[PDB]
Amino acid sequence: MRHLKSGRKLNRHSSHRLALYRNQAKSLLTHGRITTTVPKAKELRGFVDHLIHLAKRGDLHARRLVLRDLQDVKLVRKLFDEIAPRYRDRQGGYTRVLKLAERRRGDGAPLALVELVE
Amino acid sequence: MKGILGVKVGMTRIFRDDRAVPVTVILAGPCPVVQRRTPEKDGYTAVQLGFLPQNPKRVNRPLKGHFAKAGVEPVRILREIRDFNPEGDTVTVEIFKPGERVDVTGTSKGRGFAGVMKRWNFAGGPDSHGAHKIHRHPGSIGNRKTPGRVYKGKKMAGHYGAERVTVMNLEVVDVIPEENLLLVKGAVPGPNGGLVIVRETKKA
Amino acid sequence: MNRGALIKLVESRYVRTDLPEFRPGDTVRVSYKVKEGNRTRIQDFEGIVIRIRRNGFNTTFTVRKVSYGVGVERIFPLHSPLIQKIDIVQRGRARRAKLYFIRNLSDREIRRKLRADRKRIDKDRAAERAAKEEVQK
Amino acid sequence: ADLRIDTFRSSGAGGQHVNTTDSAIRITHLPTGIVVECQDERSQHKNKAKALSVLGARIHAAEMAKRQQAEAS
Amino acid sequence: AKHPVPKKKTSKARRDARRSHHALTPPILVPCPECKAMKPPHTVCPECGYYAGRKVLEV
Amino acid sequence: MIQPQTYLEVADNTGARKIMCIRVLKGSNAKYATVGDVIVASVKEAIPRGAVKEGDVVKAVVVRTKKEVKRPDGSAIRFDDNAAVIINNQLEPRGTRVFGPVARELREKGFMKIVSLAPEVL
RNA sequence: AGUGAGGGCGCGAGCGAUAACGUCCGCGUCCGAGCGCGGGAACAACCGAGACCGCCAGCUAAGGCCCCCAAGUCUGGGCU
RNA sequence: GCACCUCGAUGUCGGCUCGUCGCAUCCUGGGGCUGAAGAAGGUCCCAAGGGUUGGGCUGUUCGCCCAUUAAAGCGGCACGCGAGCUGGGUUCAGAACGUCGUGAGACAGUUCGGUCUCUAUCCGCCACGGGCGCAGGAGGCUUGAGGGGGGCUCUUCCUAGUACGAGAGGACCGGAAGGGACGCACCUCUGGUUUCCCAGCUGUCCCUCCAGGGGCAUAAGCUGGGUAGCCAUGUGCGGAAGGGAUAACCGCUGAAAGCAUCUAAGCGGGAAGCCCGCCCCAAGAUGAGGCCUCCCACGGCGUCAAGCCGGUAAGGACCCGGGAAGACGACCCGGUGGAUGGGCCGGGGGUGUAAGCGCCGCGAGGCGUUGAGCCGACCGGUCCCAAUCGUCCGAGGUCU
Ligand SMILES: [Mg+2]
Ligand SMILES: [Mg+2]
Ligand SMILES: [Mg+2]
Ligand SMILES: [Mg+2]
Ligand SMILES: [Mg+2]
Ligand SMILES: [Mg+2]
Ligand SMILES: [Mg+2]
Ligand SMILES: [Mg+2]
Ligand SMILES: [Mg+2]
Ligand SMILES: [Mg+2]
Ligand SMILES: [Mg+2]
Ligand SMILES: [Mg+2]
Ligand SMILES: [Mg+2]
Ligand SMILES: [Mg+2]
Ligand SMILES: [Mg+2]
Ligand SMILES: [Mg+2]
Ligand SMILES: [Mg+2]
Ligand SMILES: [Mg+2]
Ligand SMILES: [Mg+2]
Ligand SMILES: [Mg+2]
Ligand SMILES: [Mg+2]
Ligand SMILES: [Mg+2]
Ligand SMILES: [Mg+2]
Ligand SMILES: [Mg+2]
Ligand SMILES: [Mg+2]
Ligand SMILES: [Mg+2]
Ligand SMILES: [Mg+2]
Ligand SMILES: [Mg+2]
Ligand SMILES: [Mg+2]
Ligand SMILES: [Mg+2]
Ligand SMILES: [Mg+2]
Ligand SMILES: [Mg+2]
Ligand SMILES: [Mg+2]
Ligand SMILES: [Mg+2]
Ligand SMILES: [Mg+2]
Ligand SMILES: [Mg+2]
Ligand SMILES: [Mg+2]
Ligand SMILES: [Mg+2]
Ligand SMILES: [Mg+2]
Ligand SMILES: [Mg+2]
Ligand SMILES: [Mg+2]
Ligand SMILES: [Mg+2]
Ligand SMILES: [Mg+2]
Ligand SMILES: [Mg+2]
Ligand SMILES: [Mg+2]
Ligand SMILES: [Mg+2]
Ligand SMILES: [Mg+2]
Ligand SMILES: [Mg+2]
Ligand SMILES: [Mg+2]
Ligand SMILES: [Mg+2]
Ligand SMILES: [Mg+2]
Ligand SMILES: [Mg+2]
Ligand SMILES: [Mg+2]
Ligand SMILES: [Mg+2]
Ligand SMILES: [Mg+2]
Ligand SMILES: [Mg+2]
Ligand SMILES: [Mg+2]
Ligand SMILES: [Mg+2]
Ligand SMILES: [Mg+2]
Ligand SMILES: [Mg+2]
Ligand SMILES: [Mg+2]
Ligand SMILES: [Mg+2]
Ligand SMILES: [Mg+2]
Ligand SMILES: [Mg+2]
Ligand SMILES: [Mg+2]
Ligand SMILES: [Mg+2]
Ligand SMILES: [Mg+2]
Ligand SMILES: [Mg+2]
Ligand SMILES: [Mg+2]
Ligand SMILES: [Mg+2]
Ligand SMILES: [Mg+2]
Ligand SMILES: [Mg+2]
Ligand SMILES: [Mg+2]
Ligand SMILES: [Mg+2]
Ligand SMILES: [Mg+2]
Ligand SMILES: [Mg+2]
Ligand SMILES: [Mg+2]
Ligand SMILES: [Mg+2]
Ligand SMILES: [Mg+2]
Ligand SMILES: [Mg+2]
Ligand SMILES: [Mg+2]
Ligand SMILES: [Mg+2]
Ligand SMILES: [Mg+2]
Ligand SMILES: [Mg+2]
Ligand SMILES: [Mg+2]
Ligand SMILES: [Mg+2]
Ligand SMILES: [Mg+2]
Ligand SMILES: [Mg+2]
Ligand SMILES: [Mg+2]
Ligand SMILES: [Mg+2]
Ligand SMILES: [Mg+2]
Ligand SMILES: [Mg+2]
Ligand SMILES: [Mg+2]
Ligand SMILES: [Mg+2]
Ligand SMILES: [Zn+2]
């Protein structure tokens, strides 16, 4: 059973799966686009969404909230001062995922890209 | 054998004569007829009832043609209330008076591949005292060289639930004809959203 | 077809409003309708409310009360007709939603742990006494 | 008619034979109430023989005690 | 476990009989609306990096 | 809930202090006893010169549980201990007083005497 | 040379319990070695019968002749 | 007893798990007789549908006992079940007592210890798909041959303290209510869980000194709580009513045999049993059923192949977004003429007063801002993101 349960397991434990969503965020934000496996991507899209949407709030509290995960003060500045005001007019949906044609050789992992929109 | 299609919306208790009563609510009406069975043309009596409007932008030629003859816009699904022939062109919730007892059929929840413990309520092994990996196992399934086989219908692990099950003689508690609702003393099978058949009971 | 609202709609006809707000730690006194033999009457159960499990009309609460050496907890459906009234005897500053721990506490300890909630007491005797004022004549 | 005889598997040593052989015996003499078990030797029959023998001896000395608590009394 | 074991060499027929279902299905491709080179559907074209008629992946 | 081996405080002056249930009577194989049900229980300790002795097999009726009992009115009630009251075969209470409240369930069950003597129904 | 575990069935005896698909002798028989053929549903040794090879010929044996299944739903007389 | 299969191995007791059959019936159902007033009880007859408790002792089967019960039935199934578990017992090596033996050793004498083997090929069984068939092609809705499930029972009350009885006692029939056990479903209640939903805490390392936070202490560090979901201890509901054919049995009518006879012609009553009825599966029911509705002329000819081709029809499939569906397949919804998922917003709910700043206190802190902050699933809303665009299969209906 599993009925009506959101959120994936990704063959990781709690301690781990969380760091994943973070380092995946930290990378996505510092690069604007990254390539990951399909399901790893579909989880990540929600994560950076709340983070960014949070930075749209701009306040120091919100900033201290995002800081909890992103940890890097420098990155967080970039998120607030440059990433977010670009998204002021948009409400939710700051993230785009798209499946890639080439799976990766070593294991036939279907791939996809994840990027911030314009 | 009056009846109607509906959707199990949810449960919630109410109060009556200072007693609390567990109630599962069921969105019932309206249900337009689509075809009437008749011994002359069908070999028996029943009625094909529609429920929940369909988007004509999804209907196909064979279905639309069926719907046209009955003279009624598209609908989500059809089920037959056997041996019941209504005079109205639409069966409403009105057919049930608070007090009446009813049988409710609904597709049960789906446990998927289930263990013999959850399915058949087998005892399983002990959790201790030397049990080598059979803590939930079904144990013995037969004898020896006679019969030299396992009989049919041996209780064993498989898919549990997600199947038709009718719950008998349930009390109609209430009717909200203006909302097309229907209240029922007890618990109805399937999930909050499932298809259901409410029907006149067969107990005396 | 908001089945949610449908259910809450069904409930609406059984919803009460006449009841005071209260939080765990507050000491209350439910007047309950009971039946001794055949007759109807009112019985006052007064104790600390140790939990509230909110859930719309179906919300309920547990009151705990020592009674002749025996501790008794009792669970009341908040919107039952068998509740004539609920009087707030004394409001207290809890710290968590489920005061279960006081199941195992000396009265001296319950006392020290659940002190009087000055704010909600002050605001209570400020308001309502402000409502006694407004409806002059 | 008033004997109740039970057979069951003996206790202690014997290998597989002792495990699959209701060789032990128990006789209940319903009128009095005295009971004798016997899992001496391997044959059930011989054990019934002994038990039936002691059972007799035990009823006898019961009636002997009875006729004493009558005579002296 | 008392270590179960095949009682008879599986017949050459019954072997392949099992492998009845093992043959694979070809890939599903569409012509890319841009180049008309073949791509799996719902994926970004490897040739040009065009999807939804818009440019994305640089290639 | 009170199965065999369950202990209970006696809620009266029969001299018994704590009895262990050995059989719930309500039924030919019932799992558990609750408020109002009768259990055969054994006396596991008692006070000097009491009426009933220690180790007497006795009958008693459960007047309080730690497992909350439901009521038709939607309410429920739970005490802090499992308690009962020693009775004879005619189901009269053997004592004369009874301490600590009892559940109103007892009244319905027709235990009218026990209910009255109790210093509070709840 | 091989054999020197024999077996079944009928009959005559002992043993056994006027039990045993028991045992042990005698006479006989077949199986053994005829698990080749027909009958007895099936069945080593019961009934018929001793297969050199061929045949899209014939008569019989046992056992059968209503259908599975070859041949009488044959004739005459009784009983159930 | 025999020694016919198995010694190039057929694992032996008891327990546990799962049972299934027999009827010589323990209970409940029906009945005859009774030394049957009644309530009982005895014995026999019918009946295998269901039911047939929990503990003390012992490895124990057996048995004894405790408390119940309608009853605590007896057997078969390699004294069912060790490629299902156990390993207390038995049956290796150690060791000891009694005992026998000069002894080494030995004991249906006892005692303490003592390795039970991850992979299922076939049959069988529980589930679930792929192919093909269903002599036009499709979409829906069905019929019930056949099969499975279920099948228990107590107690009180009324009738009525009536018939019966000296009394104590105490019914038939008919009606009522509350129980136990079991089955199915369910999450409103009650109650669990809720691996990051909120909070508090210790140590330590880190960011950025304060403050605020982060990793780690489990694969949640610990603790206090906890929606949705899955659940029982929680909730509803089931066993039926009823119809038909019967068993033992009770009768009518009635010869053979002037009378009598329940039977030989013929007829009525009669069971928890049988057949229906209830629930579930079900047209591979190859005997492939039935109703409703949709689709169209083969386009070239195949000589013999009663079809060889190939774009289309109605429709279906792929792919994608998903799902109280699910191991995989399958099934269900949705795919821009769209709210399927994600985000966002709302509600619900959990936590229980964030941070920051102000105030009081030397301080630990407190108080205010403040039911604040955070806020997973549930109920909704919203095209911001993602189901883009596309591809493939599929009639053209053999005969009397
Ligand atoms: Mg793996
Ligand atoms: Mg957060
Ligand atoms: Mg690659
Ligand atoms: Mg449809
Ligand atoms: Mg069970
Ligand atoms: Mg279970
Ligand atoms: Mg072990
Ligand atoms: Mg929904
Ligand atoms: Mg109190
Ligand atoms: Mg007030
Ligand atoms: Mg004021
Ligand atoms: Mg015996
Ligand atoms: Mg005696
Ligand atoms: Mg395949
Ligand atoms: Mg007490
Ligand atoms: Mg139970
Ligand atoms: Mg003592
Ligand atoms: Mg009550
Ligand atoms: Mg007295
Ligand atoms: Mg009474
Ligand atoms: Mg009383
Ligand atoms: Mg009183
Ligand atoms: Mg020689
Ligand atoms: Mg003779
Ligand atoms: Mg010869
Ligand atoms: Mg030879
Ligand atoms: Mg021959
Ligand atoms: Mg031969
Ligand atoms: Mg002949
Ligand atoms: Mg002849
Ligand atoms: Mg003549
Ligand atoms: Mg021999
Ligand atoms: Mg053999
Ligand atoms: Mg054998
Ligand atoms: Mg058994
Ligand atoms: Mg009796
Ligand atoms: Mg008897
Ligand atoms: Mg007799
Ligand atoms: Mg003990
Ligand atoms: Mg023991
Ligand atoms: Mg021992
Ligand atoms: Mg009885
Ligand atoms: Mg008895
Ligand atoms: Mg008895
Ligand atoms: Mg017995
Ligand atoms: Mg047996
Ligand atoms: Mg031992
Ligand atoms: Mg041993
Ligand atoms: Mg050994
Ligand atoms: Mg041995
Ligand atoms: Mg030894
Ligand atoms: Mg010697
Ligand atoms: Mg010596
Ligand atoms: Mg000497
Ligand atoms: Mg012995
Ligand atoms: Mg030993
Ligand atoms: Mg391994
Ligand atoms: Mg067809
Ligand atoms: Mg078909
Ligand atoms: Mg049928
Ligand atoms: Mg049937
Ligand atoms: Mg009288
Ligand atoms: Mg009368
Ligand atoms: Mg009387
Ligand atoms: Mg998170
Ligand atoms: Mg710091
Ligand atoms: Mg801090
Ligand atoms: Mg929950
Ligand atoms: Mg239960
Ligand atoms: Mg019931
Ligand atoms: Mg009736
Ligand atoms: Mg009948
Ligand atoms: Mg007959
Ligand atoms: Mg007969
Ligand atoms: Mg008579
Ligand atoms: Mg009659
Ligand atoms: Mg007559
Ligand atoms: Mg006559
Ligand atoms: Mg006459
Ligand atoms: Mg008749
Ligand atoms: Mg029949
Ligand atoms: Mg039917
Ligand atoms: Mg069906
Ligand atoms: Mg069909
Ligand atoms: Mg032409
Ligand atoms: Mg030619
Ligand atoms: Mg899909
Ligand atoms: Mg907001
Ligand atoms: Mg709140
Ligand atoms: Mg905080
Ligand atoms: Mg909210
Ligand atoms: Mg989350
Ligand atoms: Mg969310
Ligand atoms: Mg969701
Ligand atoms: Zn291209």
UniProtKB/Swiss-Prot annotation, chain A:
Cystines in this chain: none
GO cellular component, one term: cytosolic large ribosomal subunit
UniProt-listed GO biological process terms: translation
Family to which the UniProt record says this protein belongs: Belongs to the bacterial ribosomal protein bL17 family.
Pfam assignment, any one: Ribosomal_L17
UniProt feature coiled coil, ranges: none
Name of the gene this protein is made from: rplQ
Keyword Ligase in record: no
Protein name as annotated: Large ribosomal subunit protein bL17
Record key words, sorted: Ribonucleoprotein, Ribosomal protein
Keyword Lyase: no
NCBIfam families: L17 (TIGR00059)
Curated annotation (Swiss-Prot), chain B:
Record-linked SUPFAM superfamilies: Translation proteins
Superkingdom to which the source organism belongs: Bacteria
Molecular functions per Gene Ontology: rRNA binding; structural constituent of ribosome
Alphabetized PROSITE patterns for the sequence: RIBOSOMAL_L3 (PS00474)
Keyword rRNA-binding: yes
Function: One of the primary rRNA binding proteins, it binds directly near the 3'-end of the 23S rRNA, where it nucleates assembly of the 50S subunit.
UniProt similarity note: Belongs to the universal ribosomal protein uL3 family.
Subunit field text: Part of the 50S ribosomal subunit. Forms a cluster with proteins L14 and L19.
Protein name: Large ribosomal subunit protein uL3
Annotated source species: Thermus thermophilus (strain ATCC BAA-163 / DSM 7039 / HB27)
UniProtKB/Swiss-Prot annotation, chain D:
Coiled coil location: none
PTM description: Methylated by PrmC. Methylation increases the termination efficiency of RF1.
Compartments where found: Cytoplasm
Modified residues (N5-methylglutamine): 16
Task of the protein: Peptide chain release factor 1 directs the termination of translation in response to the peptide chain termination codons UAG and UAA.
Similarity field: Belongs to the prokaryotic/mitochondrial release factor family.
Protein name: Peptide chain release factor 1
Gene symbol of the encoding locus: prfA
Region of the whole protein represented: 220 to 292 of 360
Swiss-Prot record, chain E:
Gene: rpmF
Extent of Basic residues compositional bias: 1-22
Keywords: Ribonucleoprotein, Ribosomal protein
GO cellular component: large ribosomal subunit
Family of this protein: Belongs to the bacterial ribosomal protein bL32 family.
Record organism: Thermus thermophilus (strain ATCC BAA-163 / DSM 7039 / HB27)
Phylogenetic lineage: Bacteria, Thermotogati, Deinococcota, Deinococci, Thermales
A GO BP annotation: translation
Region called Disordered, residue ranges: 1-27
Presence of the UniProt keyword Nuclease in the record: no
GO molecular function, one term: structural constituent of ribosome
Superkingdom of the organism of origin: Bacteria
Subunit structure: Part of the 50S ribosomal subunit.
HAMAP family for this protein: Ribosomal_bL32
Stated name of the protein: Large ribosomal subunit protein bL32
Physiological role: Found on the solvent side of the large subunit.
